[PDB]
């Protein structure tokens, strides 16, 4: 057994839509793909969930910023300041 | 001139501060720790994997018993079997009937998977953390090196001297016990080396890959084959390597707090953004200008002009230079209220530039230094619309 | 039967527990902590060593100046010097009288006894403990493992199942930074690596042996040559290597508290006997006797004949034996008063046999479980005239 760097997985691109401090993210994969994040306060409050359905999901982002993992495409991140004027 | 600063740990944005040496021209800062790789202190524990029931060939005595030993071999499990007729492709061989005996001797061995796919323990102690910090400073305009943030560690790569840290902010993301596999590293309590229950995480337990001694708590039970036919009947739990794969827990770089990402490298905990680092650098003083060289710009103005209430440098102000000289400026807001995209600005004999920044209070009432000369932009800033995109610049939210 | 017991950490003395299990014949023990080795989690930070200024070899120009750059050599110090006229030979060689101009140049670089004479700095942290711990158990009469501390590893080494620890003594005699050379072990506060001043202790401070990069605060500080010969003056202090083995300070194994010893071996602090260690086995059942195969000793006397108040196993006492069959018994005093020689005497037909202890009241009144009978072997003691040898066997010393 190797380290081969099998031709490998990708899912399809999210849909981004914004909200005050929130990321709703209409979504659609291949096959169930391991989401998760990690809200970088020291406050992890992390989510994890297989997605195969597609979902329009939901993430409460905080001031500082969320970080967004669409299967093994790499992770994004994101600023979330006001948007409440 | 020794510039001591608290400074944010945060990576991915400038920090430019100001030199403000009593006598020469004053110089900007453009200190961005592009990394906080961490590197704590480890101990390789013992590596796991998935087993492999290498079984040895049994023995098959035809007319008596052959008592088996305790071989060395990690959880050597072996019992002798009587009663068999072992139908081996001439029908049965050994003519007897019940003294026909079957030795079954079967031991646990690393597979050829642990050596290349393997979880790996470590005992996590705090070490020392890292950064490649690039500063495209005054007019030197670069240096990216790598440095340390022990408080008495320089690092002249450049020209200038600088000393980092100890940061205050001691969160180690890593637990004292970690798993690691591969990319996903699991900050989980291992049960230990010589231990793991079987079935459980670490039914197998190597100290590393070369090492033939192991701990092989794998419940491994033979049984007697069936109806006087060769084979051999290891009943046993599948790896604790196995599950651990598929009814495992999250990854640290998928559940961490306060912002880290992660590498089976070095073992780093990369971009961990939290708390402060009080940095403090001894500038090479030939990169000073002296003060009577650059121009005098007060008797000026400053006002914003679109003043966005926002993290992306949306901030913009006019500012009525009136200089004496015509040259370059270094800029900034001694209060941290105001983020600057612009570390310096050229000047003619007494124009006027805008410069571009970003606020966290509704009235900025920042102050900026152009070149020894303080000003308040005071003013008013509108919120935006468009907020799903990377980190900020701004990084500065208080009481507003 | 897991006979859990709490357990002195204390090295070179057996600890003859007694197994009371409800059904068959007890067994004593004999836990010997011949070793305890410790091990902390560690890392090497940098070697030091004394420096060696091998100078390269200057530059003499003639007729004009040669401009010297910063080579990145370490600690690569070299300075233009004109004004020679240097003798060589020959008396001088360059015909002109001012524009001779000398380069000397000087980089500090491991010795060759940097590879071998060597001081050796760490960050230590605790890690994890171990001992090669004789049992000459029961009847066993012996094994000699290697085991740890953490209180669920076991080492089936032998035929017997222990678990020892975690121990409550977490004294780690070796300070969270330490200095070692060669076998003389330093708690230093060592600066660290990169900022070691000159003429302190790790003015060259080497990751490792190997690595060609480093730091070197020497203070090398080149003069010129005198009256026009060739020569270059290095100025420089010698080395924090050179003191630091004279003016240094004593080893932790001549100054260590609680009982320890030390090796450059993997870093352990030997025989640390601090604390205690709550101890548990999981025996053979094999190895146990059934209860009614050994002699009941009951309707027994037990008295003193000459008890030493003292270390040394003085303590005598003769029982008058009361047994149903004949063959041996195992014994012990669950008190902790007494401490005997004898795990085991063997019985004729109800006779008589002196064993030997120790004790540290004056009046003790220590049971004695003599396979299933306790007794009280109540007397008094003569304190002894000779103590100038080793360690005791007693080490049970209360109110008295």
Known sequence: PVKAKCIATLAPEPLVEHKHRTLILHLHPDHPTLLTTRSLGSDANPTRQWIERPTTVNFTVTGEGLEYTWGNHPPKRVWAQESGE | ?400
Not at chain 2, 31 to 55: A, D, F, G
Not at chain 2, 111 to 125: F, G, M, T
Request: proline share 7%; glycine share 6%; aromatic share 10%.
């Open chain 2, 1 to 400: 001139y020794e510039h001591t600063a608290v400074m944010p740990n945060k990576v991915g944005i400038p920090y430019k501060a100001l030199v403000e040496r009593p006598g020469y021209a004053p110089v900007h800062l453009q200190i961005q720790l592009v990394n906080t790789r961490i590197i704590p202190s480890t101990n390789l524990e013992y590596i796991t994997c998935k087993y492999k029931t290498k079984v040895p060939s049994p023995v098959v005595k035809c007319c008596g018993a052959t008592q088996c030993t305790s071989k060395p071999h990690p959880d050597y499990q072996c019992q002798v079997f009587t009663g068999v007729y072992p139908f081996m492709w001439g029908g049965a061989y050994c003519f007897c009937d019940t003294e026909n005996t079957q030795m079954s001797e079967a031991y646990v061995e690393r597979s050829e998977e642990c050596s290349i796919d393997h979880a790996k323990a470590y005992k996590v102690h705090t070490g020392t953390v890292q950064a490649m910090v690039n500063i495209t400073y005054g007019s030197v305009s670069w240096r990216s090196a790598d440095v340390y943030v022990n408080g008495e560690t320089p690092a002249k790569i450049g020209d200038a001297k600088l000393i980092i840290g100890p940061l205050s902010s001691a969160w180690s993301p890593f637990d004292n016990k970690v798993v690691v596999y591969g990319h996903e590293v699991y900050n989980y309590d291992f049960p230990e080396y010589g231990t793991g229950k079987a079935g459980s995480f670490g039914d197998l337990q190597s100290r590393t890959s070369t090492s033939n001694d192991l701990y092989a708590n794998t419940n491994l039970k033979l049984q007697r084959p069936q109806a006087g036919i060769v084979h051999t009947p290891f009943t046993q739990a599948p790896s604790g390597f196995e599950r651990w794969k598929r009814d495992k827990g999250a990854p640290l770089n998928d559940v961490a707090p306060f912002g880290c990402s992660i590498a089976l490298e070095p073992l780093r905990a990369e971009n961990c953004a939290v708390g402060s680092i009080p940095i403090s650098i001894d500038i090479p003083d030939a990169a000073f200008t002296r003060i009577s060289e650059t121009p005098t710009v007060s008797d000026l103005e400053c006002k914003i002009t679109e003043c966005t209430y926002a993290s992306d440098f949306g901030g913009i102000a006019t500012v009525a230079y009136k200089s004496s000289k015509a040259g370059n400026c270094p800029i900034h807001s001694p209060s941290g209220v105001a983020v600057i995209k612009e570390n310096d600005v050229t000047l003619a004999e007494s124009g006027s530039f805008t410069f571009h920044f970003s606020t966290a209070n509704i009235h900025p009432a920042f102050k900026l230094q152009v070149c020894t000369s303080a000003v308040t932009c005071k003013g008013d800033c509108k919120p935006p619309k468009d907020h799903i995109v990377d980190y900020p610049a701004q990084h500065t939210e208080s009481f507003t």
